[PDB]
Each structure stands twice: as C-alpha cells, then as structure tokens.
Design an enzyme around this catalytic site. Structure first.
Site, mmCIF file in Angstrom:
data_model
loop_
_atom_site.group_PDB
_atom_site.id
_atom_site.type_symbol
_atom_site.label_atom_id
_atom_site.label_comp_id
_atom_site.label_asym_id
_atom_site.label_seq_id
_atom_site.Cartn_x
_atom_site.Cartn_y
_atom_site.Cartn_z
ATOM 1 N N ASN A 200 -7.783 8.645 -5.871
ATOM 2 C CA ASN A 200 -8.827 7.540 -6.438
ATOM 3 C C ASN A 200 -9.358 8.176 -7.501
ATOM 4 O O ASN A 200 -9.761 9.436 -7.748
ATOM 5 C CB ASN A 200 -9.549 6.862 -5.608
ATOM 6 C CG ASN A 200 -8.700 6.169 -4.571
ATOM 7 O OD1 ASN A 200 -9.063 6.415 -3.302
ATOM 8 N ND2 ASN A 200 -7.796 5.504 -4.785
ATOM 9 N N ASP B 287 -12.609 8.193 -8.206
ATOM 10 C CA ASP B 287 -14.027 8.496 -7.880
ATOM 11 C C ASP B 287 -13.528 9.890 -6.983
ATOM 12 O O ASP B 287 -14.597 10.564 -6.551
ATOM 13 C CB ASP B 287 -14.873 7.569 -6.696
ATOM 14 C CG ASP B 287 -14.046 7.317 -5.403
ATOM 15 O OD1 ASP B 287 -12.894 7.792 -5.354
ATOM 16 O OD2 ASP B 287 -14.845 6.766 -4.625
ATOM 17 N N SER C 170 -11.874 10.325 -4.012
ATOM 18 C CA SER C 170 -11.524 10.126 -2.747
ATOM 19 C C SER C 170 -10.008 10.094 -2.734
ATOM 20 O O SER C 170 -9.388 10.033 -3.832
ATOM 21 C CB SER C 170 -12.427 8.750 -2.295
ATOM 22 O OG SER C 170 -11.797 7.819 -2.899
ATOM 23 N N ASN D 64 -9.112 5.029 2.976
ATOM 24 C CA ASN D 64 -9.593 5.727 2.182
ATOM 25 C C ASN D 64 -11.067 6.920 2.651
ATOM 26 O O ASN D 64 -11.473 6.227 3.532
ATOM 27 C CB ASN D 64 -10.447 4.906 1.035
ATOM 28 C CG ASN D 64 -11.155 5.691 -0.149
ATOM 29 O OD1 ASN D 64 -12.356 5.727 -0.139
ATOM 30 N ND2 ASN D 64 -10.182 5.988 -1.128
ATOM 31 N N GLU E 217 0.775 -1.246 0.077
ATOM 32 C CA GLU E 217 -0.148 0.060 -0.032
ATOM 33 C C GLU E 217 0.871 1.199 0.029
ATOM 34 O O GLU E 217 0.500 2.171 -0.871
ATOM 35 C CB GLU E 217 -1.045 0.237 1.410
ATOM 36 C CG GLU E 217 -1.966 -1.220 1.296
ATOM 37 C CD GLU E 217 -2.982 -0.870 -0.051
ATOM 38 O OE1 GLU E 217 -3.081 0.351 -0.807
ATOM 39 O OE2 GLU E 217 -3.955 -1.771 -0.004
ATOM 40 N N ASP F 134 -15.269 -4.955 9.195
ATOM 41 C CA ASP F 134 -16.586 -4.308 8.524
ATOM 42 C C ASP F 134 -17.294 -5.476 7.553
ATOM 43 O O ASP F 134 -18.321 -5.251 7.336
ATOM 44 C CB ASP F 134 -16.186 -3.168 7.697
ATOM 45 C CG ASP F 134 -17.310 -2.490 7.070
ATOM 46 O OD1 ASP F 134 -18.245 -1.732 7.690
ATOM 47 O OD2 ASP F 134 -17.627 -2.556 5.900
ATOM 48 N N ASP G 267 -6.545 7.878 -0.560
ATOM 49 C CA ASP G 267 -6.046 7.058 0.247
ATOM 50 C C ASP G 267 -4.882 7.700 1.021
ATOM 51 O O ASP G 267 -4.019 8.118 0.508
ATOM 52 C CB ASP G 267 -5.524 5.909 -0.528
ATOM 53 C CG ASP G 267 -6.473 5.354 -1.312
ATOM 54 O OD1 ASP G 267 -7.776 4.999 -1.080
ATOM 55 O OD2 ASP G 267 -6.124 5.054 -2.471
#
Ligand SMILES: [Cl-]
Ligand SMILES: [Cl-]
Ligand SMILES: [Cl-]
Length: 129
Positions: A46, A48, A50, A59, A35, A101, A52
């Site tokens: 990203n 979209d 967003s 994110n 990562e 989650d 990280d």
C-alpha cells in the site's frame, strides 16, 4: 494455494465464516475473488507502506505483524506470513475480528466496490455445501 471457487466456499463454511456477523458465504467468496483471485499467497504493498496479505488481503497497519510497517498494530496477534498459508484458518479467524470492528465488510474496500449490493449468491451457486 489457489483455491477453486466451491473449494474455498467449503473451507470458509468449515471455519464458521458462513453468515458470520450476518454476511452470507457468497459475500466472503466474492470478497476473496476480488481481493486475491483465491490465491492464499497474494501480497500487495500500500501507499502508506503497509502490506495486504492472503486470500482476504488483510492489512499490516492494524491486523498482523510484518516488522516493516512503522506505527502499526497486530490486533490478530499473528505474523502476516500466517495469512499466506494453504490452510485458511488464520485468515478466517482474523477476518472474524475485522468484520466485527464496526463497519462490517466495508473494511474490505473491494467488497464495498465490487460485491456489496450484487447477487453474491452467484459465488456459491452449484457448490455442494
Ligand atoms: Cl450467498
Ligand atoms: Cl511493524
Ligand atoms: Cl475496489
């Protein structure tokens, strides 16, 4: 801060990540390697819109607030900047929520693609832990 491999393993263990939700320490170190290359200041934008953040590339669509991700949540209740600190506490605490989650470490697509099913213990081999 760019952590050493064993240094990060030790910090993760210190913060209770070792075997958290059944994921051995090597899984977490492997995820961080791919990562962020162990760099707490890593950021990536990203498609979209967003972003990280940090050693585990957490994110802003779901987990932290950066003020620039429309329609997003802040489920870890932290500014995304907290995920860039030399102190990994905020990243670890948020990662604990993420991995709980529902989909385990598959939440980290790089873990799924590069760590899952591999000899992850290699990532902590030789480490005084
Ligand atoms: Cl391991
Ligand atoms: Cl936002
Ligand atoms: Cl990937």
């Amino acid at each position: 801060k760019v952590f050493g491999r064993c240094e990060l393993a030790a910090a993760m263990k210190r913060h209770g990540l070792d075997n958290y939700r059944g994921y051995s320490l090597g899984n977490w170190v492997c995820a961080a390697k791919f990562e962020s290359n162990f760099n707490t200041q890593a950021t990536n934008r990203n498609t979209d819109g967003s972003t990280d953040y940090g050693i585990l590339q957490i994110n802003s669509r779901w987990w932290c607030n950066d003020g620039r991700t429309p329609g997003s949540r802040n489920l870890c209740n932290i500014p995304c900047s907290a995920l860039l600190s030399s102190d990994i506490t905020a990243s670890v605490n948020c990662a604990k929520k993420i991995v709980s989650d529902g989909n385990g470490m598959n939440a980290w697509v790089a873990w799924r693609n590069r760590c899952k099913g591999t000899d992850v213990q290699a990532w902590i081999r030789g480490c005084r832990l």
